Amino acid sequence: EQVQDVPTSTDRKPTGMHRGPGKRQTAPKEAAQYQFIKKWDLQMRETWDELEPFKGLPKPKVQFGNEAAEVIWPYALLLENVIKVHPYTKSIYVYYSQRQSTPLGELAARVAKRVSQAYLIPITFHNSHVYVEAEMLLEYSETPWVVVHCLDGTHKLIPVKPQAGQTVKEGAEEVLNGIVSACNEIGSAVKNPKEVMRLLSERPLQNQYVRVNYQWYGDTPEERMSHLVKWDYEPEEVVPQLRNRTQHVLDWMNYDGNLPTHNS
Amino acid sequence: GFTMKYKRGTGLWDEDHVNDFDANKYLSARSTMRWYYGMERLQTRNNMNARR
């Protein structure tokens, strides 16, 4: 990892004065010391890389608004922001200007760039059909837009319109309810579904680039699938195929006159 | 251990389902009074024991 040149020794005076095998050589507590110390000294030389684990993942398309991909995301964070969209939406693009002239234009781009960072990449990781991508345009475009596509090839625009008084910490939440609304509305207003039921069940994984720091989830791919495992207590399926008893349907209520009375 | 305790009183008389190997061929006059009084005793000796 570039820090694996641990000196196979350590300053510590060897306990066990006498003699024997295993003396004066590194310990797995000391091997983690030098690993951290010489990790920091790179992290000052800036040569230290964090794409050492994420070597198989296809390196995301670099772009100036697409820094959301190169971030190593905490798996305990992508669990919190569990956003889901209608499955027939193939992609989401969120473009926004670089510098925004009007004061309310800088408001929206803040929301876009926020939603470009906060809510877009969880949707990728959670839904895995959508190809979430964000690009920062370069001009005084005081309004960002969102291109919510769909599997049928159709698509819409979602003019990112936050209110002047609101913050951006909810301006996205509005935009969120402005996208996940459309996604179902587009997916409800689709044409014949037999085709998109094939593409969707053919669309490869779009979220491969996503870099998830599986923190305290490193035991086995069982817990790496912990966001797909979804407990469902009180599950309800009350539609039984009842098979009634046609032959001798009566005759349960007509027998064993218990201990025949005085007449018989 | 398990000794068929659900059979102690579930016999038709008092001398039944009580294992008494101590028998004899001819139980005499007072050995028979001793016997009949015996079966009922360890039938009421058992009960009021188990009731107390």
Partner: protein, 213 residues
Amino acid sequence: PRNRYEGKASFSRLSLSKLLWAVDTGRLNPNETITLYHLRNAKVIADREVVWPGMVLLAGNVERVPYPLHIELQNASAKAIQLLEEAGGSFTNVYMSHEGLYQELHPEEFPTFMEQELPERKGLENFATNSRKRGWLAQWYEDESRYAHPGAGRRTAHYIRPPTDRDFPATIEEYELAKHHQKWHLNQPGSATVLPWHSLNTADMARRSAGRL
């Protein structure tokens, strides 16, 4: 060479001659579908011969059955079935779990219907759902079970409900595992579904590899 593990399908043989001998003798009533309660309570078979699972009807030298005879037994032999079925009878092979074996022999201890669990998976493979024995689930299996969930794709045809909103592999390690498997096995049609390449050699996961149909 003849071991009996926990769950073996080894029946005690009730020769059809015995059952046919009784029905005329008068121990068994030909009207009432002769479930194993009647056989046990009429002293046709004792306690020392009904060990789970119940019995097996064997057409032993019985070249003919004269009257329409109805039976609810466990795993009749194929000839014994085609003998009752010729004389207008029936044979609906009940293959009850052990919990069902009790509540059929001593129902005077179960005042109400205490629900019965379906038999072991090994039994459902061979008797309970197999129409060759007219197992009692050969109606249900084709009617309700053999159909997948109305949302399941190709990979999740066996889950009670498709665990994803899309048939395809969910995450990377479910994918690269299936991207390697489908070319680990030479590219077969269904080889997409990753399978464990180690055979436990258990008797439960054993179903008739060769046999009649």
